[PDB]
Design a protein around this ligand. Structure first.
Ligand SMILES: [Mg+2]
Ligand SMILES: [Mg+2]
Ligand SMILES: [Mg+2]
Ligand SMILES: [Mg+2]
Ligand SMILES: [Mg+2]
Ligand SMILES: [Mg+2]
Ligand SMILES: [Mg+2]
Ligand SMILES: [Mg+2]
Length: 117
RNA sequence: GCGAGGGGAGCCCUAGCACAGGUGCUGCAUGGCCGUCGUCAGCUCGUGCCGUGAGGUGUUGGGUUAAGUCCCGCAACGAGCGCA
């Protein structure tokens, strides 16, 4: 039961601050705000979830990234509640593209994890 | 070797020979050691990112220190010669 739970308080967002390539997903500009098409979210939802379903059961990994302040914390809840990785404070340059190197910092962390206890 | 002592074994001489010797020149052929900017807060590298490219970013910015000293930020994340 997704559906009207979306209308819940989760439809529409910003205004005249838009990217016009996002025009297809918009239902209207009621009250000078861009109300995003409720139901197209649903059509995008299943397709997405289906990719996650597949990815999940294949034992793969999602990386959760929310550094904007309202998401900061609700990201680290759900990611831990999924045993998945998350990036929370700052996205660093090349966490992915220079992974090997940024990894060496994980490597260092648990050398110091190893000198507290 | 001879029972009557001649054969360049050390050693020492003179006569030749290979050589020694040169604080003669070139610090603009050099090593090394030194002076010097300056004990000044700097100079870089790896990988990533940006640029057709030289290169850039990091090392800019805000605060702070004697200090590229530390801090906060940040397409950078770290490191090395320095600083201490
Ligand atoms: Mg950062
Ligand atoms: Mg000279
Ligand atoms: Mg010299
Ligand atoms: Mg001279
Ligand atoms: Mg290129
Ligand atoms: Mg330092
Ligand atoms: Mg300074
Ligand atoms: Mg010192």
């Amino acid at each position: 039961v997704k559906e009207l739970l979306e209308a819940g308080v989760h439809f529409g967002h910003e205004r005249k601050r838009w990217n016009p390539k996002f025009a297809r997903y918009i239902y209207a500009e009621r009250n000078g705000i861009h109300i995003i098409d409720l139901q197209k979210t649903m059509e995008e939802l299943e397709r997405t979830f289906r990719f996650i379903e597949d990815l999940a059961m294949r034992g793969g990994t999602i990386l959760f990234v929310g550094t904007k302040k309202q998401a900061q914390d609700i990201v680290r809840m759900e990611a831990e509640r999924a045993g998945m990785p998350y990036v929370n404070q700052r996205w660093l340059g090349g966490m992915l593209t220079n992974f090997k190197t940024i990894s060496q910092r994980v490597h260092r962390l648990e050398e110091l994890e190893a000198l507290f206890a």
